[PDB]
């Protein structure tokens, strides 16, 4: 949560990084990671979704936000009302002048009884659509490996809404709704995996092995580069004659 509304020109991921909330899997994890990194910001704007007839702000034992249970801060775990889970049919127009990135998900319970307990319907259904695109996810009820005390999962999906387009969320169960949207941007932002420390110094080029000078035209440090880096080459050395015979 310390990274809320953060912005970067280079997000550096550490090999020691770990997840400590509800176990989740992102179908096409690479695509979401890459587009979020290219966006360069986690600027999140909450929106007034009117989830009628359901319990908002669900949580789990695995995801301890404070003294007790919690959940992802940018997701809303909808749960049955007293004894009903209506067919949510909410909508959100994009009257703004920029693309909106909505991150949502679908819950995968471990057992049929768990599914019926969280959601009155024996089988769930999530549909998230725009004027052109659409996605529908059918929850799968089955036991996964024990992770942080849970055999269930959450499958994370994303939708991008252009200006003038409108989002529609229609669900009958197993909806991990969004709390808003991430303001997308276009620019120089990217992401990198590196264990190297960060220091107060100047460098136009960055690599997982650390910053390197860019005076020379070629480099043999790493093929992963950011900035005005020299072109990667397999040769360890290349002596150019700055003199005569």
């Amino acid at each position: 949560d310390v990274f809320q509304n953060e912005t970067w020109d280079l997000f550096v991921e550490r090999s020691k990084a770990f997840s400590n909330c509800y176990p989740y899997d992102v179908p096409d994890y690479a695509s979401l990671r890459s587009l979020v990194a290219s966006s360069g910001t986690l600027e999140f704007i909450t929106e007034g979704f009117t989830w009628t007839g359901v319990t908002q702000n669900g949580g789990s034992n695995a995801c301890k936000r404070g003294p007790g249970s919690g959940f992802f801060s940018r997701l809303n775990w909808l749960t049955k009302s007293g004894s009903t889970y209506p067919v949510l049919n909410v909508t959100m127009p994009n009257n703004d002048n920029f693309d909106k990135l909505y991150i949502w998900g679908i819950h995968h319970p471990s057992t049929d009884q768990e599914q019926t307990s969280l959601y009155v319907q024996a089988s769930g259904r999530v549909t998230v659509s725009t004027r052109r695109s659409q996605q529908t996810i059918i929850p799968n009820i089955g036991s996964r490996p024990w992770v942080r005390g849970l055999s269930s999962r959450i499958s994370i999906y994303w939708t991008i809404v252009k200006p003038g387009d409108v989002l529609v969320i229609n669900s009958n169960g197993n909806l991990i709704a969004p709390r808003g949207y991430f303001k997308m941007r276009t620019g120089k932002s990217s992401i990198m995996r590196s264990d190297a420390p960060i220091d107060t110094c100047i460098s136009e080029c960055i690599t997982p092995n650390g910053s390197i000078p860019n005076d020379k035209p070629f480099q043999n440090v790493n093929k992963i580069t950011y900035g005005a880096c020299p072109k990667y080459v397999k040769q360890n050395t290349l002596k150019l004659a700055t003199g005569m015979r």
Partner: antibody, heavy 120, light 108 residues
Framework: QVQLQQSGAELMQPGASVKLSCKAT????????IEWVKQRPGHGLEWIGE????????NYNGKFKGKATFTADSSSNTAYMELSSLTTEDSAIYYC?????????????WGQGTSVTVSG | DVQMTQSPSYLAASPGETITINCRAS??????LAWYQEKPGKTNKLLIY???TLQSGIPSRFSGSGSGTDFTLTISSLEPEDFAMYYC?????????FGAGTKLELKR
């Protein structure tokens, strides 16, 4: 053969905290809601809250938001409720009850009721 | 928060007769009401759920009716064991609420 059996009676001083327990036998404890209800003379049954032990999803009544705190141990099929900062008004019987879609979330089985007496 | 009133708070009856017990909600709860029995010495028991569905194992002499804000439970041919305490509970709106309950006696 399905039942919920709770802890014995409790005698607490004001300002203390007590963890009532409820073991469940005869079914998959992780799948059904365990719902905690308060009863005392005149006021009658008063629903405290519920927990889905498998997920740990906890959900409280507003009047007991800070008073109660549910927990579950799936290995022993045991739910727990930690009543904190006890006062004389908390003296009451507390029931744990099984709930699920089988009975349309009406509590189809109940514990025997653990009594708590708060007094200095 | 759905408050309730279950009437009459006191019911006087004798074995063998048929009776009805009323429950009223502050606002609509559709069809979701349940009727429970409490007697000393053992666990509370679920009689009816969803207003009119009979719980398994319960004798058919218990039968519920109603909807919206008005509900009733008919207890027919009172056995001597049926003289216990009874509660009505909503499970439509989330904060489940119980009626104050009714006392059913015998040999009136």
């Amino acid at each position: 053969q399905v039942q919920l059996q709770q802890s014995g009676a409790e005698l607490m001083q004001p300002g203390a905290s007590v963890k009532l327990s409820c073991k469940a036998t005869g079914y998959t404890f992780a799948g059904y809601w365990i719902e905690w209800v308060k009863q005392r003379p005149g006021h009658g049954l008063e629903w405290i809250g519920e927990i889905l032990p498998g997920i740990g999803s906890t959900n409280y009544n507003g009047k007991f938001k800070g008073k109660a705190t549910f927990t579950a141990d799936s290995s022993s099929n045991t739910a727990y409720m930690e009543l904190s900062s006890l006062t004389t008004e908390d003296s009451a019987i507390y029931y744990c009850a099984r709930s699920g879609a089988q009975a349309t979330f009406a509590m189809d089985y109940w514990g025997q009721g653990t009594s708590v007496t708060v007094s200095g | 928060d759905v408050q309730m009133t279950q009437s009459p708070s006191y019911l006087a009856a004798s074995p063998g007769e048929t009776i009805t017990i009323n429950c009223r909600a502050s606002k609509s709860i559709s069809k979701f009401l349940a009727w429970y029995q409490e007697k000393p010495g053992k666990t509370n028991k679920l009689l009816i759920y969803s207003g009119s569905t009979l719980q398994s194992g319960i004798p058919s002499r218990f039968s519920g009716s109603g909807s919206g804000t008005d509900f009733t439970l008919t207890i027919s041919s009172l056995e001597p064991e049926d003289f216990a305490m009874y509660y009505c509970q909503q499970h439509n709106e989330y904060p489940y609420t119980f009626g104050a309950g009714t006392k059913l006696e015998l040999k009136r």
